[PDB]
Amino acid sequence: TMMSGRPGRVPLQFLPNEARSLPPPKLTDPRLVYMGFLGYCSGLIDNAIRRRPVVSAGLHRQLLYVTSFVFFGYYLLKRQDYMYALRDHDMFAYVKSHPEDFPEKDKKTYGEILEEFHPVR
Amino acid sequence: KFYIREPPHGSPDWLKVGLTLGTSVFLWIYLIKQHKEDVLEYKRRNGLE
Amino acid sequence: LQYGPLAFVLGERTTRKLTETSKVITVDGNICSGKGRLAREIAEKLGLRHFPEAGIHYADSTTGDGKPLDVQLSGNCSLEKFYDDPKSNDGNSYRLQSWLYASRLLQYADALEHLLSTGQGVVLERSIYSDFVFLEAMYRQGFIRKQCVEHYNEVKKVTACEYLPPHVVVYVDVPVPEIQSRIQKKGNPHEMKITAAYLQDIENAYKKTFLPEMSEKCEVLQYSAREAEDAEKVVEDIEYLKCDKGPWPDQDDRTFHRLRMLVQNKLEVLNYTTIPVYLPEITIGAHQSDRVFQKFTELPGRKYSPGYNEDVGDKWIWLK
Amino acid sequence: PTIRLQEDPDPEDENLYEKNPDSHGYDKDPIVDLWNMRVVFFFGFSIVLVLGSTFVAYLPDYRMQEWARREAERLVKYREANGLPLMESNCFDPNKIQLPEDED
Amino acid sequence: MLKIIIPTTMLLPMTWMSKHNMIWINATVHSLLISLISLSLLNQLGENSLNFSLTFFSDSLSAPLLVLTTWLLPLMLMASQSHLSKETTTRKKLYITMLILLQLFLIMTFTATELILFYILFEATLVPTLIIITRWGNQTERLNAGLYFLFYTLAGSLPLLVALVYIQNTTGSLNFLIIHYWSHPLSNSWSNIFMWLACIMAFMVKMPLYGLHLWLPKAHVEAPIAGSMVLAAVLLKLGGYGMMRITTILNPLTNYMAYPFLMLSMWGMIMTSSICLRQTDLKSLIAYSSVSHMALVIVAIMIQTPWSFMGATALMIAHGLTSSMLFCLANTNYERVHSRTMILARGLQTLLPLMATWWLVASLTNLALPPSINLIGELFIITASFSWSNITIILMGMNMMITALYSLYMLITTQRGKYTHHINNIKPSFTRENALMALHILPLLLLTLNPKMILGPLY
Amino acid sequence: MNPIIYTTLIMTVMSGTMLVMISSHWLLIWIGFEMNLLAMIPVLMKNFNPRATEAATKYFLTQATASMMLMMAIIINLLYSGQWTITKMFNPVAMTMMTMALAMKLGLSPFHFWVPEVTQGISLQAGLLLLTWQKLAPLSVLCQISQSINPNLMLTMAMLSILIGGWGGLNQTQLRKIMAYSSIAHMGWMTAVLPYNTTMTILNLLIYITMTLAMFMLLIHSSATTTLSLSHTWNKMPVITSLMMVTLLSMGGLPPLSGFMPKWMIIQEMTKNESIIMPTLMAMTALLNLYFYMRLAYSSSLTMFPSTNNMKMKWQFEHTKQMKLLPTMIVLSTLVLPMTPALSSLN
Amino acid sequence: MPLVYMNIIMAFAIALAGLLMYRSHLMSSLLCLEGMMLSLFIMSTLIILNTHFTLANMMPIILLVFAACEAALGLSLLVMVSNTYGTDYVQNLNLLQC
Ligand SMILES: CCCCCCCCCCCCCCCCCC(=O)OC[C@H](COP(=O)([O-])OCC(O)COP(=O)([O-])OC[C@@H](COC(=O)CCCCCCCCCCCCCCCCC)OC(=O)CCCCCCCCCCCCCCCCC)OC(=O)CCCCCCCCCCCCCCCCC
Ligand SMILES: CCCCCCCCCCCCCCCCC[C@@H](O)O[C@H](CO[C@H](O)CCCCCCCCCCCCCCC)COP(=O)(O)OCC[N+](C)(C)C
Ligand SMILES: CCCCCCCCCCCCCCCCC[C@@H](O)O[C@H](CO[C@H](O)CCCCCCCCCCCCCCC)COP(=O)(O)OCC[N+](C)(C)C
Ligand SMILES: CCCCCCCCCCCCCCCCC[C@@H](O)O[C@H](CO[C@H](O)CCCCCCCCCCCCCCC)COP(=O)(O)OCC[N+](C)(C)C
Ligand SMILES: CCCCCCCC/C=C\CCCCCCCC(=O)O[C@H](COC(=O)CCCCCCC/C=C/CCCCCCCC)COP(=O)(O)OCCN
Ligand SMILES: Nc1ncnc2c1ncn2[C@@H]1O[C@H](COP(=O)(O)OP(=O)(O)O)[C@@H](O)[C@H]1O
């Protein structure tokens, strides 16, 4: 576990204050739409298990399912984006801090790079 | 008809229906407000607008 | 609030509703006896609830509306065909016996649930503990094979061990020739085909195995044909008994809680009736099973849950 | 019972032509069967097949083959008139290729 | 290209929200409309593929397969609504749901630009086909058929996932454009040899190869008609499309490494063509014919020349159409007679003339009659193989002879002679079956009119 | 058993595992293990019968032996460094003791023998608890000391677990033993990737818990503990059979089903650092788990077994006590593959 | 290490083997568990005393407490097994197989 221990990391925050500098996901985000679809599927399965009209048994229950899934998905996406941004930030800081381990190599053109040719026959 | 009471009455249990609808509305408005606050904070921190 | 662990946690116990007049009462008599009127009169005098004898379509009267369903959808057996052709090759005899045992089990569960939830006693007309007499009668006459009685014994062993035997057992003793005379005088064309050996085997079974076994756990009040009409005398005999020998005075609140959680949830009651033992009399093929299930699902009020059937006039479905 | 199951008898085949001499073999109810035939024919033979084939036959030349022919005509004309070879063996300019200095 | 994917995901709830007696009509109409819409991808640039988005792209190789799948679904719906007449509404809707899900996964498979997404959809196509085969079959062997079909595919395709993740870890990407532009030769080492094997064997067993073909007869015989159609028309072409996509990374190892697979393909093509002659069943003969044709396609892909690639694409499309038509033709007789034996019902030309004509046309297109696209693909493959080696012409000619022999043998046994004298329930052909046959056969001739649409990207 | 006593025993079990998961002292971790075992023993014996008694006896003996080995490991590690904090655990002999003790507590092979028997001897509720909740604490301790742990020892036991789980599951007809062997096989996968990345271990744990919860809850809904008893529920609750078939496919590792995500991620993570042979073997072995899941699915929903006459009476009654979280567990068990990138929220 | 530490560790190993051998009875195995705990207690208290760690002097008491809990659990299970079978033999615990 590479990121479990990190400097200045509050244990059980789930959303550090540093994560507020990133753009929040849009409310029409496709992943949020998939979360809402998952909630709708769970509501339909709930209706089917209880032997109720699957499509239209309980509208309030299905609405609660969808809104709960969307509500959790928003914060899940926020945390996921924060972690990926944190990973990229640490990667760039490390590559800048150690230039000798990531040198800029020469830029040859294909006119002088010699590649062996394999005929197809 | 049904010989037994059918605990699900001829009218819904309005208490639970009210609770579920209120919970859904509260979650939706909280999500809207949270998104607005987050986007305002994002615009402020980077100084875009 | 529906009874459960939480209802037991705060408040509701069972022993605080028993008023010394629970007295699960069972009346056992030879075919075509006065046990029905005796049970009705006992229930009326003692103030208990009367449970008529569990027929083929007993479970039909407990679900939906009380109107019985078609014989194809419920039971798949008939008593008249058993009286007319007891040695049939379609296995109607043991199918009927097993279905009747299941119906009696369901009725006993209902009676126990009512007694535990309310406290008012019940008066059954025949229990699961006295159902094997007909089984032995069929087996001795050659109406059924031995594998059928083995399957019955397995089901009884796994089912009847969860409940409590009745407080007092009342037996109406009537001789075989009197039973035959009453059958002849009754009038139903099918019942005059009941042979004397069948009734004799039933009674031999009742005296030899049932009453001796019940005398170890309950109180047995045998009677006769002439003393079964003055129900006041039998009520007085019942209300002057010593109920101290059975397991009923040895029940704590936890045992009653478990029993009450088991008597409701009728699926848990009937679980072990459909054990995967493949007897030709009771096994039903996949195609016929599918056809009959599809037919049952198309009934007016059987498609959905008992509150979500717009067919029988249920409204406000989309908000339940 | 000298059997093993309470099994339904195997049903015999149901002929669609018995209760409907002009069946089309789609359904039992004549009206929905006729309409199923009509929609199948109209959307398979009329719409998709003929219109789709005439749409495919008239697709614009996005494969650049008439363009390739015109390019070839002009290049052949220019090259032959000048006395230059019709086609050149080296696909790329040798001046822009830096071969290894030596092979010993 | 969501304008094709989304209408299928709308076909799903529309099917589930239809009336009890209107499901077939709606499904057929809207699937035909979707196929008409998907017919718009045939406009392909000669330079490079059409890249709609970061995830989906269409090539000259993908478009004929997409059109074939979208055209296949309505025919499968038409063929399935005969033996399902006694089914309940819910199970009919479930069957249509399986067909729609299979089409959706197939459409997303042929256009995925990333190899892991392609693998995920390529394997997601396993669940609905398995459910169809093992739930709506007819005999007791459908369970073993499904087990074989699942495990032959999975035991060969699990190493492909390891190979792909290793490739992404090494090179850095799995996007097909980046893979093609940044491709580099593979050295001669044991590690690279096992890389070749891992990348190839999944598509090889999906073709199938001669030694790994045992699942195909079981699956194609024990499946229902729609399952057989979708297996023999498109689900087999997944392996060929996969090799044609994955081979770019493999060179120069493939020239050295293709000797056993080429030998197996040629000799097993001969062997399966010979097996078709002594077959007592009718669907097994078509299954083995499919095996022979797909072995020819394997040879074409393995020798890896532009003419071989064009021939492989043409043969794939032509075989899909022809095998689907043959399976439907056999299914009609099976529905009449309720048996799969070939010599049970004889002399059906005197009783069903139009079906005799359809049988003749299908058999003629099966044995590569000019100028049908079957012969175009077969001849291009034969020419490419002859350039590869002049001795292959012996095997190709022997295969052609045996193919003609068994095709005409099946046609003569089922259609000519005298009737069986004791089958009196052969009713006249319905309109549905004739329409299905015509919708199978007319596109073949329309395609041989304009063969450049199905010759692949090397054209 | 009284409901208050039952709920306080369950809370004591959860308190023990939380004490394990939140403690930095080795002694407090050992105390949490002891508390968990002590409060877990009666839960197995809630329904009294000889089989439950002997299942509890075997479970107690195995857990007590594992605790003894664990405390010996702690004492040796203290001996070679006066440190109590759960850390590297440098000492090789002490680390071997701890790894083997935690494997015995988890059920990893060759210590896998106890799991099938205890699962068969207890009810479905106790089996659910044992197979899902009783894996958190040993896995937490393993994750904390993962860097210290030797790869060869850990890998050998994971591969053995996968192999033996598949082979054992191939044979059983009882559903509880099938679930136990599947649990062993999944433990193998989870402990396989432990030395390389604990995030994949946590993700596989979450998905395995979700799938096992869904499967046990469906089994409780249709009160069947054998293959033949499950072959009847198509005639009473076809929706349950369909959902069970989909969940069984998901457990197998097929894609697009969610179950595939842990397997795919573990293979991908093990490939990043030159481990090629092992993922191939683990996949080809998980094919066996898929096979016996598929056999169960054939028996359950994809075919129709003959039924009995008394099922007509069950047709008239509804399931009274309804599980609230069953649909959500089913959905998370099947349709959550497209949300793979959200695993970064676990590290 | 001095000979005392090796003797205590050897005693622990002997007790562990004795537990794992399972001759006929169950009291014998419970005694083996108690012996393993006693060896752990002695080793721990020796190590703590030697390094003068004042605070951990209370830890062996907790060890003893949870040893008593384990012993009570084992005794209860043995009581129930003996009531079921009339004998505490381990051969009778074979109703469940693998
Ligand atoms: C990728 C793209 C998206 C794809 C994602 C996947 C699919 C979608 C998500 C899946 C979850 C959603 C639904 C699942 C729960 C439903 C439960 C159910 O059983 O359905 C029955 C129910 C019919 O019941 P009913 O109407 O109450 O009365 C009949 C009785 O129920 C009488 O019922 P019965 O019980 O008597 O019938 C018996 C039957 C009952 O058993 C069943 O019906 C099977 C239940 C399905 C299994 C659920 C699996 C859980 C989700 C996992 C999906 C896996 C996906 C991966 C691909 C692999 C597929 C396996 O059992 C059998 O027949 C046994 C046969 C064995 C076959 C084995 C196959 C089983 C697995 C198939 C799964 C296929 C995927 C789900 C597709 C949808 C199916 C409903 O179907 C419905 O009516 C609802 C279906 C969904 C409605 C969608 C409508 C959306 C909104 C409408 C408008 C659209 C937009 C408008 C706006 C336009 C702009 C203006
Ligand atoms: C497969 C489906 C699994 C779903 C799981 C249940 C979903 C509903 C449960 C509700 C979620 C709330 C739980 C936690 C919220 C608040 C607690 C918060 O503080 O926890 C912190 C952060 O929260 C958790 O760490 C992550 C919670 C996110 C769970 C989602 C992951 C699911 C896997 C991805 C597949 C897509 C699933 C889609 C869900 C619908 C802990 O940080 P930290 O103290 O530093 O961790 C130390 C231990 N580590 C580093 C080794 C891990
Ligand atoms: C029953 C009675 C039978 C006998 C009666 C017959 C009556 C007479 C009919 C016979 C006609 C003789 C044929 C003569 C040929 C004329 C038509 C031909 O010339 O058109 C071709 C055109 O052919 C079409 O391109 C065919 C396209 C293929 C149709 C695709 C199938 C439809 C989709 C359905 C699903 C298929 C799935 C398969 C997946 C690929 C030429 O193509 P091309 O010269 O270049 O382009 C010309 C236009 N340009 C120059 C401006 C570009
Ligand atoms: C039913 C059909 C299923 C599918 C069949 C797939 C066939 C796969 C077979 C793979 C073909 C070749 C594999 C290895 C390439 C060369 C093989 C060998 O003959 O070449 C010699 C190699 O010498 C020895 O023969 C090595 C191979 C001996 C050990 C391998 C076992 C072969 C026996 C057959 C096993 C069965 C295989 C199928 C399993 C079911 C040449 O020596 P050398 O040029 O210096 O080394 C070549 C390799 N280098 C260049 C990378 C270093
Ligand atoms: C219908 C059934 C079909 C079954 C087909 C299964 C066989 C598939 C072929 C082998 C699959 C596994 C190969 C591994 C996948 C690629 C991994 C890779 O490329 O890395 C190799 C690793 O290669 C291997 O490890 C291969 C080990 C193979 C172990 C399992 C063998 C399985 C059976 C072998 C024979 C199968 C081949 C022919 C079978 C024909 C069909 C019967 C290089 O290692 P590096 O870490 O990069 O280090 C090199 C630089 N120092
Ligand atoms: N287990 C059984 N097997 C067969 N028949 C039974 C069984 N139980 C009850 N019956 C039938 O129920 C009928 C009514 O019972 P009975 O008490 O004799 O008549 P009545 O209702 O007038 O009191 C009897 O004819 C008897 O055969």
Curated annotation (Swiss-Prot), chain F:
Major localisation: mitochondrion
Q: Where in the cell is it found?
A: Mitochondrion inner membrane
A single Gene Ontology MF term assigned here is: NADH dehydrogenase (ubiquinone) activity
**What is the enzyme's class at the highest EC level?**
translocase
Which Enzyme Commission numbers does its entry carry?
7.1.1.2
Which keywords does UniProt give here? Electron transport, Membrane, Mitochondrion, Mitochondrion inner membrane, NAD, Respiratory chain, Translocase, Transmembrane, Transmembrane helix, Transport, Ubiquinone
Q: Per the database entry, which stretches of residues form a coiled coil?
A: none
Q: Which family does it belong to?
A: Belongs to the complex I subunit 2 family.
**Per the record, GO CC terms?**
mitochondrial inner membrane; respiratory chain complex I
Membrane topology of the entry: Multi-pass membrane protein
**What is the protein name stated in its UniProt record?**
NADH-ubiquinone oxidoreductase chain 2
- Please give the start and end residues of each transmembrane region: 3-23, 25-45, 59-79, 89-109, 149-169, 178-198, 200-220, 237-257, 274-294, 325-345
| A GO BP entry | mitochondrial electron transport, NADH to ubiquinone
Gene symbol here is MT-ND2
The chemistry this enzyme catalyses reads:
a ubiquinone + NADH + 5 H(+)(in) = a ubiquinol + NAD(+) + 4 H(+)(out)
**The organism of origin for this protein:** Sus scrofa
- Work out whether the entry's keyword set contains Nucleus: no
Q: What does this protein do?
A: Core subunit of the mitochondrial membrane respiratory chain NADH dehydrogenase (Complex I) which catalyzes electron transfer from NADH through the respiratory chain, using ubiquinone as an electron acceptor. Essential for the catalytic activity and assembly of complex I.
InterPro entries assigned to the protein according to its UniProt record, in alphabetical order: Complex_I_Subunit_2 (IPR050175), NADH_DH_su2_C (IPR010933), NADH_UbQ_OxRdtase_chain2 (IPR003917), ND/Mrp_TM (IPR001750)
Q: How does it assemble?
A: Core subunit of respiratory chain NADH dehydrogenase (Complex I) which is composed of 45 different subunits. Interacts with TMEM242.
State whether keyword Transcription regulation applies.
no
From Swiss-Prot, chain G:
Please tell me which top-level EC class this enzyme sits in: translocase
Q: What does this protein do?
A: Core subunit of the mitochondrial membrane respiratory chain NADH dehydrogenase (Complex I) which catalyzes electron transfer from NADH through the respiratory chain, using ubiquinone as an electron acceptor. Part of the enzyme membrane arm which is embedded in the lipid bilayer and involved in proton translocation.
**Pfam families (UniProt xref):** Oxidored_q2
Source species: Sus scrofa
Summary of subunit composition and partner proteins: Core subunit of respiratory chain NADH dehydrogenase (Complex I) which is composed of 45 different subunits.
User: Which keywords belong to this entry?
Assistant: Electron transport, Membrane, Mitochondrion, Mitochondrion inner membrane, NAD, Respiratory chain, Translocase, Transmembrane, Transmembrane helix, Transport, Ubiquinone
Give the main localization category.
Answer: mitochondrion
Quick one: a GO cellular component term? mitochondrial inner membrane
UniProt GO MF annotations: NADH dehydrogenase (ubiquinone) activity
Q: How does it sit in the membrane?
A: Multi-pass membrane protein
- Protein name (Swiss-Prot/TrEMBL): NADH-ubiquinone oxidoreductase chain 4L
InterPro entries from the entry? NADH_UbQ_OxRdtase_chain4L/K, NUOK/Mnh_C1-like
